[PDB]
Design a protein around this ligand. Structure first.
Ligand SMILES: [Mg+2]
Ligand SMILES: [Zn+2]
Ligand SMILES: [Zn+2]
Ligand SMILES: [Zn+2]
Ligand SMILES: [Zn+2]
Lengths: 112, 87, 141, 559, 168, 147, 101, 60, 56, 171, 95, 107
């Protein structure tokens, strides 16, 4: 009921004028803001202090403090994140990156 | 561990080849045709590698296969022949 | 050893090579041959356009005062605690004489050229038994 | 250049792991033993003294050295050196954590206050994400400023079973300045013992007692022994970065104007030698405290200058010295301004005007811009003649090339190139040539806010320098011609050209995904004209209708 | 990970290296014991591989006398591969120089004996690659073998191997 | 040393350019030379190539005017101190931006001659034409009244 | 199977409402041939209308909410500050109203 | 540097003809012509008088 | 802030709306799996009217 | 000494070689980049085993280049130069401060300090012969040398040895 | 020119990941290094005239890889180490 | 099930978590004067058997932590009385498909 009321509220605000955006975007925002069992504001700390990649979390202006925390806790960063793949310069598994392109000797044989 | 892959049967992914691998396979085939790799269908004076790849897709002869990553790590495979190109 | 690099076109070799700089491209080309030599040159004028250590010597000068993002009492604490190494170097005497001749030259409304020349003249000798004190007035004047 | 090919296996980065340095790690990986606070101009010319600035680390320019590993400049990544401190000092990035953990553990025993016998901290140990466990432990062990040897009686029925090491008492630490004071009330006189030992805890004793912690205890506190140790969390031996981090800006009038970080390091080494001479000779024990305080202060400043506002620690001149936190903070400090976004290459920027003679996927580009920009092509059997002709043109008329790239990492510039008619342009090479027509290219308007405003276009080269685009695409860009300006972005390879043409092209973005109605349309002049033309009360005669019919380009030829 | 020094010497008191230890796993999941080899056994199997791949190429374009054999497998090697294998020429020269048996059947009988004895693999492979008939002298040569094996058992195996192998 | 390709021919014996000549984009106008000493200024770490380390000032890389009214006079303390001036004609082009006295800023789309400019009965061919749609939404009545 | 059935409830209900037999015979007068044609077109279009896998829905949603927050205006709080509060909670009231039925 | 001036505004085809004589493929007996270094001051006249002639069927 | 918070959300081949860690945000995407574009404001023809009109 | 193990390789293939018959082409490439090669982990790589039924079966196109990457699994024979036991090598070249023994593939050297001081070395020999009773350096020169240690580096293999032991140098 | 965060974002929204990578390397830094396969550090001395890749401290001459990186990221790692902090492991070790 | 008029002294509630596997649950009448689930913003909640939960994990290939969570101290969680490690299927009346399924984990 919390997320339903929240969706009602955000729809009310953004539909007071300049309506409308599609429903699914708003629903996605609500859900990612409520998918922790509790309300989680998108602040410098709210979503930022999740068990999420240190590089994207230091892309959000608490940089040296959160890097010190990461160094002290010595945790590992999975590099499945877009920001990690950008600052490491590899192509992110995104859109066209979301798969691999595999050769096929069998079809190559079959199509002489 | 347990082979991290799947049999060709019970592949529970859509049979409709979608836009991102459309672009990717066109780009790759364009690059091989650019670097003097063997083409696999006849030509009609066209010299653009991308259009060559476009026709080569149009009658369905691409010597590539695709690998889709499920979120765990297990993966399906598909042959670009066995997809369908409608968008 | 000497670690030194001289550019040389490996296909012309006819001289110390007559090459040119294509500064807008950051590249160097053997002008007789036309092959690029090295790429991604580093800037040489915008670094100056962005904005005396030799007179002050090898030791590095520091004009330290007070800031803005701190309390006035802490600036006073900074001024009291910044005076803990004014006796290890002879540079304290160097900028002491520099301040004195700054007072004297700008009291004599002299040019900056004259001020720097006097700085050089003191820095050149600056310590000898031939100096031998002389109340610092003889040597400064 | 060929970038000096190496047979090391090219692989990609998949995992990244943080941590700290053990002092033996930094001493092992270091190359130099920087000891002279003066850096440059030993006599006083060049080939600087064996202190800073490459005895055996990153060179300056045009010298191969890089501790004799010979990658000129632009391949040597720099090589670390290190210095040795007289005394251990803190870390401003870990001050509060040191306070919390010294609260957490008992000194003189070096063990946890609470040990698997209060069921509340038992389940606190049980719960773990990684650090809420640590915070729970910390807030449960605020109290009991005496360490104990035998607390637990109700673990058993009433049996009092000893586990502890020392019966000593703990202070109450007050964080202050850049140091830590204790206060042992201790309540064990003949009276109340109202004597708190206001004693500044030595970095040495904190280091020792941190060395006296269990592995076990590290895991409880959330430390990884192979990567993160509390005794590694105190600075003893300090790495230095090579001059590629802190380059002498080479002031480009006559001088060097050598830079900020190296100034601060010279300060550090000066205070280091001052402290050690003062220690080694007659130490009257009233210069020691402020000398080490200055040393710790300055290394704290070098680390960060954005601290609680008791110092500011500026150099010459009145601009304060920027530390690494100031170098890495938000708004173009190395992350939001060099990694997440950056300068690029292959781009252009002019102003725009309408044109009703370009269809939507086209863009008009000045010949000057298309002469500056370029795009490589690989030489095939198919394009050999056309590229040969286009090389033969030379780099001055428009449909011509600028560079030729051979199979090895070669670039023969066509500008000088007196053998321009003599290159036979063999296969497998790259010819880098001007923008021809209907190449795909990306298009921008600041500020980009939604999915549009990066749209691709084909290019028709036009004279009279300015950009040129169709009027219908105006509102997605959100750009009237009052003096606005766009941006161009030329792709550089086949993959990127293909995916750009197949995704970011305009005509497959008519329907706005954000609001499920098309974002394009026809606008002012043609709208007014189309209502004017579509009225029952108007009519056209034969000559006008013939010209209009010929203006429709795909008109089939039937009237 | 901890920089994992692990200083280790290779000897015959079961003092074996990690990088080539005994129990591996093969790529299909079955356990992969270490394959150590004899000099005469290697001398046989290089010929076996050579004749196998030569007949493989005979099918490809279709669809023990050491003085002849070294130069014949040499010209077979520069039939397809390159002439850079001068060190490989040195290796089969070493094999034909010091391999304890020229013939295949003595090697096969020795391995048929050792498959019943169940000796230590790297130990008996070192013994087979060595070419000697004196057990006590071998123990003086290698004090690792001197500490490991009893001289009586060493000679009782060495003589019933020595009568079989082609003496040099 | 490492002096540019500005083709220094436009200068004179006193290291300046003369007024009234034309300059292209890359022509240098001022000649400078390093008086250091101590650098072993013509005896070491350079050939001869005497003592240059040239600090010449090229013109801005695009524009191309005519040098007009060059003066030299000593500075505050007494040096050699130079000011030049260059003059350029700037004909209107496509992209230039004009405006009324009512906030109707805009630029030139394209240009036409008279014979296809529209024309009235007396033959007063107009200077410029702006679109009517800039009138109602901008609400700029006084522009019309002024006209 | 259950999720797939419950994911097309609205669409199939609408389809049933359109292609009720009394309606199609009375209003639209189809043929057998054109009836097969409209069935195939509905099927083909709907299968062309599914989400393509592998694209950045979150960024799409974020931009689609962000840009019409730029052209939005500024008793009861509204507008930009109310949106900031409800997006940034911040358990402060400024209008803690509650409707009671 | 390669923006054209007004020399190419009316000077007839340098290494080039004055006109192309290309057959249409969409209707019988149709031909398109490309004049260059000319404009309306020609074209309108030719089109109008050719349309005044009766045997033609289309001229634009 | 908003675009930073919702970066890595991806539709995956299992039609789930996941973050980087694979945490599930939507199970089927958007509760329908339907795209962002191919949607019109067409009308249900069963809600309205009378009961009598509906059965008519 | 020589070893047999299943081993994996890592091979790029240029897109020009995407012709209809590439499996045996890759087998050929495996041949001249396995046979006659040296490394540090496995030493000198001698020859291949299991020529049939080899394991490649699949390959990925690299993203930025049309090169196709393949993973090859194969049985083979290599050499493992040990340390601390006796080999009866041959010597081809010699230096003034010791002979350089070529025990098969590598060239192991013995320093003039690593030879026993009571060995009666005469410098006036061609090659300089460090002989006492029978171990005269010849074209054959069967010398029982014990590898000190074959020091491993980047793929250029080097070893050290000595003859300061009874029947070391003596056969 | 500038390729800021918002441009990066709407490129993400398109999904042209290879274009984004191309714009982040070739239009910019594109630096090469070598990393220790055991330390995970960038201390590898690479005498490329001799194919020598000793990693002192680690003391190996074998486990070496070369990678591709933005130069600014190389720099950021350099001063992160100067802050006494970043192992760069070349493959998975979690699964 | 235990219902108190007003406050509980901690001495009378310290030993509530005693005698496993028997569990004791506390409630205020003020918290029970109005049924929470009858509010129309609250969707239907149902409980998952351990078997079908395991089936759910094997189908959607999650591992037990990627599900969206729900607090133990939640009102509907306390209404159902479930404990750690349980999964609640949630049926709510969507607007783009009508009926839509989702799951939470009580962690
Ligand atoms: Mg993460
Ligand atoms: Zn040259
Ligand atoms: Zn170096
Ligand atoms: Zn204690
Ligand atoms: Zn290392």
């Amino acid at each position: 009921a919390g997320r339903a009321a929240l969706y009602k509220e955000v729809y009310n605000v953004i539909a007071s004028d300049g309506s409308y955006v599609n429903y699914r975007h708003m629903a996605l925002l609500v859900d990612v803001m409520t998918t922790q069992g509790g309300l989680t504001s998108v602040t410098r700390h709210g979503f930022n202090r999740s068990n999420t990649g240190a590089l994207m979390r230091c892309s959000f202006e608490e940089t040296v403090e959160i890097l010190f925390e990461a160094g002290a806790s010595a945790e590992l960063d999975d590099c499945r994140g877009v920001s990690e793949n950008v600052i490491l310069g590899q192509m992110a598994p995104i859109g066209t990156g979301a798969f691999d392109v595999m050769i096929d000797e069998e079809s190559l044989v079959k199509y002489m | 561990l347990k082979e991290k892959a799947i049999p060709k049967d019970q592949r529970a992914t859509t049979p409709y080849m979608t836009k991102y691998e459309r672009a990717r396979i066109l780009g790759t085939r364009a690059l091989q045709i650019s670097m003097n790799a063997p083409v696999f269908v006849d030509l009609e004076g066209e010299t653009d590698p991308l259009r060559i790849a476009m026709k080569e897709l149009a009658e369905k002869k691409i010597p590539l296969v695709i690998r889709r990553y499920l979120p765990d790590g297990s993966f399906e495979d598909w042959s670009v022949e066995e997809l369908i190109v409608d968008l | 050893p000497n670690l030194n690099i001289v550019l040389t076109c490996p296909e012309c070799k006819v001289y110390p090579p007559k090459i040119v700089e294509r500064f807008s491209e950051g590249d160097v080309v053997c002008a007789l041959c036309g092959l690029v030599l090295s790429d991604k040159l580093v800037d040489t004028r915008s670094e100056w356009r962005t904005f005396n250590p030799l007179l002050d010597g090898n030791n590095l000068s520091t004009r330290i005062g007070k800031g803005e993002t701190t309390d006035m009492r802490f600036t006073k604490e900074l001024n009291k605690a910044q005076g803990k190494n004014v006796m290890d170097k002879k540079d304290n005497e160097v900028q002491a004489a520099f301040a004195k001749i700054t007072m004297l030259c700008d009291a004599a409304e002299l040019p900056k050229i004259v001020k720097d020349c006097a700085k050089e003249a003191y820095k050149l000798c600056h310590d000898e038994k031939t100096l031998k004190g002389k109340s610092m007035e003889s040597i400064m004047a | 250049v060929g970038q000096q090919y190496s047979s090391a296996p090219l692989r990609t980065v998949k995992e990244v792991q943080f941590g700290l340095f053990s002092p033996e790690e930094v001493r092992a990986i270091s190359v130099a033993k920087i000891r002279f606070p003066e850096t440059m101009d030993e006599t006083q010319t060049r080939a600087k003294i064996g202190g800073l600035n490459d005895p055996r680390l990153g060179s300056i320019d045009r010298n191969l050295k890089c501790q004799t590993c010979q990658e000129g400049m632009n391949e040597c990544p720099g090589h670390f050196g290190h210095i040795d401190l007289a005394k251990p000092v803190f870390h401003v990035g870990f001050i509060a954590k040191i306070k919390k953990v010294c609260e957490c553990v008992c000194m003189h025993c070096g063990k946890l206050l609470l040990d698997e016998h209060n069921e509340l901290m038992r389940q606190a140990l049980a719960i773990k994400d990684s650090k809420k466990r640590f915070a729970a432990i910390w807030t449960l062990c605020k109290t009991k400023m005496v360490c104990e040897t035998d607390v637990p009686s109700e673990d058993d029925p009433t049996q009092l079973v000893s586990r502890g090491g020392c019966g000593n008492t703990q202070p109450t630490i007050r964080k202050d300045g850049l140091k830590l004071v204790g206060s042992w009330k201790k309540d064990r006189a003949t009276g109340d013992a109202d004597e708190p030992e206001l004693r500044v805890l030595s970095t040495e004793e904190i280091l020792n007692i941190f060395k006296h912690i269990s592995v076990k205890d590290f895991t409880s506190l959330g430390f990884n022994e192979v990567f993160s140790r509390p005794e590694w969390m105190i600075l003893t031996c300090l790495p230095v970065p090579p001059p590629p981090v802190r380059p002498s800006i080479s002031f480009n009038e006559s001088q060097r104007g050598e830079d900020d970080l190296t100034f601060k390091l010279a300060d550090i080494l000066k205070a280091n030698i001052s402290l050690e001479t003062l220690e080694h000779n007659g130490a009257p024990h009233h210069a020691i405290e402020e000398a080490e305080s200055l040393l710790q202060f300055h290394v704290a400043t070098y680390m960060d200058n954005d601290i609680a506002g008791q110092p500011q620690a500026l150099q010459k001149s009145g601009r304060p010295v920027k530390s690494i936190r100031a170098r890495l903070k938000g708004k173009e400090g190395r992350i939001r301004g060099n990694l997440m976004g950056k300068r690029v290459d292959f781009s252009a920027r002019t102003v725009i005007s309408g044109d009703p003679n370009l269809e939507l996927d086209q863009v008009g580009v000045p010949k000057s811009i298309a002469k500056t920009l370029t795009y490589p092509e690989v030489v095939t059997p198919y394009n050999i003649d056309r590229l040969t002709q286009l090389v033969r043109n030379g780099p001055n008329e428009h449909p011509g090339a600028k560079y030729v790239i051979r199979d090895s990492g070669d670039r023969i510039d066509l500008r000088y190139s007196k053998r321009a008619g003599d290159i036979q342009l063999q296969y497998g090479w790259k010819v880098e040539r001007h923008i021809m027509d209907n190449d795909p290219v990306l298009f921008n308007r600041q500020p980009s806010l939604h999915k549009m405003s990066m749209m691709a276009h084909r290019v028709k080269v036009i004279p009279y320098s300015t950009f040129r685009l169709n009027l219908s695409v105006t509102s997605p860009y959100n750009a009237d011609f009052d003096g606005d300006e766009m941006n161009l972005h030329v792709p550089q390879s086949e993959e990127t050209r293909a995916e750009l043409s197949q995704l970011c092209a305009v005509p497959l973005q008519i329907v706005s995904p954000q609001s499920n109605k098309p974002c394009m349309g026809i606008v002012q002049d043609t709208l007014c004209g189309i209502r004017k033309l579509t009225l029952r009360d108007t009519f056209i005669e034969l000559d006008q209708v013939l010209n209009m019919l010929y203006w429709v380009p795909d008109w089939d030829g039937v009237i | 990970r901890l920089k994992k020094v692990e200083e280790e010497e290779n000897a015959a008191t079961l003092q074996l290296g990690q990088e080539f230890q005994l129990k591996q796993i093969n790529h299909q999941g079955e356990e992969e014991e270490l394959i150590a080899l004899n000099l005469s056994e290697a001398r046989l199997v290089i010929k076996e591989a050579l004749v196998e791949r030569r007949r493989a190429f005979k099918r490809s374009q279709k669809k023990e006398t050491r003085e002849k054999e070294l130069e014949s497998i040499d010209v077979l090697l520069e039939q397809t591969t390159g002439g850079n294998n001068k060190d490989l020429k040195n290796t089969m020269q070493y094999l034909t120089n010091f391999s304890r048996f020229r013939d295949q059947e003595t090697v096969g009988a020795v391995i048929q004996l050792l498959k019943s004895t169940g000796l230590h693999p790297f130990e008996v492979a070192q013994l087979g690659s060595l070419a000697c008939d004196t057990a006590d002298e071998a123990k003086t040569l290698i004090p690792s073998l001197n500490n490991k094996i009893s001289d009586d058992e060493l000679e009782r195996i060495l003589k019933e191997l020595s009568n079989l192998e082609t003496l040099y | 040393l490492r002096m540019k390709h500005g083709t220094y021919d436009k200068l004179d014996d006193d290291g300046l350019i003369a007024p009234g000549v034309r300059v292209s984009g890359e022509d240098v106008i001022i000649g400078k030379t390093t008086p250091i000493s101590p650098d072993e200024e013509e005896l070491g770490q350079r050939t001869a190539y005497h003592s240059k380390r040239d600090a010449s000032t090229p013109l801005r890389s695009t524009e191309n005017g005519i040098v007009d009214q060059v003066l030299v006079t000593t500075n505050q303390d007494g040096l050699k101190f130079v000011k030049v001036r260059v003059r350029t004609t700037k004909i209107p082009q496509i992209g230039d931006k004009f405006a009324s006295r009512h906030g109707q800023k805009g630029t030139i789309g394209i240009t036409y001659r008279r014979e296809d400019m529209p024309f009235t009965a007396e033959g007063i061919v107009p200077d410029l034409i702006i679109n009517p749609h800039a009138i109602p939404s901008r609400m700029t009545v006084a522009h019309l009244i002024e006209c | 199977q259950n999720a797939q059935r419950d994911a097309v409830t609205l669409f199939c209900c609408l389809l049933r409402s359109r292609l009720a037999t009394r309606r199609v015979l009375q209003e639209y007068r189809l043929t057998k041939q054109a009836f097969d044609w409209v069935l195939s077109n509905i099927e083909a279009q709907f299968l062309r209308s599914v989400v393509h896998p592998g694209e950045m829905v979150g960024v799409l949603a974020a931009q689609s909410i962000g840009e019409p927050a730029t052209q939005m205006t500024l008793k009861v709080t509204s507008g930009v500050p109310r949106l900031k509060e409800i997006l940034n909670v911040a358990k402060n009231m400024k209008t803690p109203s509650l409707t009671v039925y | 540097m390669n923006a054209p001036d007004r020399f190419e505004l009316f000077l007839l085809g340098e290494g080039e003809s004055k006109l192309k004589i290309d057959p249409d493929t969409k209707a019988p007996n149709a031909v398109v012509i490309t004049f260059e270094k000319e404009d309306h001051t020609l074209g309108n006249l030719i089109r109008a008088e050719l349309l005044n002639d009766r045997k033609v069927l289309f001229a634009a | 802030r908003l675009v930073k918070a919702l970066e890595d959300i991806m539709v995956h081949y299992d039609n789930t709306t996941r973050n980087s860690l694979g945490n599930v945000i939507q199970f089927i995407y958007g509760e329908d799996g339907m795209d962002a574009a191919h949607i019109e404001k067409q009308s249900l023809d069963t809600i309205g009217g009378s009961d009598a009109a509906f059965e008519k | 000494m020589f070893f047999i193990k299943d081993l994996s390789l890592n091979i790029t293939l240029h897109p020009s070689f995407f012709g209809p018959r590439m499996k045996q082409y890759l087998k050929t490439k495996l041949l001249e980049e396995v046979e006659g090669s040296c490394t540090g982990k496995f030493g000198y790589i001698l020859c291949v085993l299991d020529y049939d039924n080899i394991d490649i079966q699949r390959g990925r196109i690299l993203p930025t280049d049309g090169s196709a990457e393949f993973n090859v699994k194969y049985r083979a024979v290599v050499f493992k130069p040990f340390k601390g036991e006796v080999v009866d090598g041959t010597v081809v070249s010699c230096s003034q401060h010791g002979f350089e023994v070529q025990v098969g593939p590598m060239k192991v050297f013995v320093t003039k300090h690593l030879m026993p001081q009571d060995l009666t070395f005469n410098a006036g020999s061609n090659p300089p012969s460090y002989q006492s009773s029978e171990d005269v350096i010849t074209i054959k020169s069967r010398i029982r040398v014990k590898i000190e240690g074959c020091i491993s580096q980047v793929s250029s293999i080097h070893a050290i040895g000595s003859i300061k032991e009874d029947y070391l140098g003596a056969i | 020119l500038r390729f800021g965060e918002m441009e990066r974002d709407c490129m993400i929204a398109h999904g042209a990941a290879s274009f984004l990578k191309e714009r982040l390397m070739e239009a910019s830094d594109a630096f090469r290094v070598h990393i220790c396969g055991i330390c995970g550090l960038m201390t590898v001395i690479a005498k490329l005239n001799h194919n020598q890749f000793e990693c002192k401290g680690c003391d190996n001459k074998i486990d070496i890889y070369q990678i591709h990186i933005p130069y600014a990221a190389k720099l950021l790692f350099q001063e992160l180490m100067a802050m006494n902090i970043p192992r760069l492991y070349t493959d998975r070790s979690r699964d | 099930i235990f219902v108190y008029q007003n406050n509980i002294t901690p001495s009378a509630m310290k030993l509530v978590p005693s005698i496993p596997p028997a569990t004791i649950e506390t409630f205020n009448e003020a918290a029970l004067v109005v049924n929470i689930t009858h509010h129309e913003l609250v969707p239907k909640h149902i409980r998952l058997s351990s078997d079908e939960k395991r089936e759910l994990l094997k189908r959607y290939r999650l591992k037990e932590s990627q599900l969206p969570r729900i607090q133990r101290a939640d009102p509907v969680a306390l209404y159902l009385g479930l404990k750690r490690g349980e999964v609640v299927k949630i049926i709510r009346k969507s607007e783009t498909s009508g009926r839509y399924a989702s799951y939470r984990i009580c962690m």
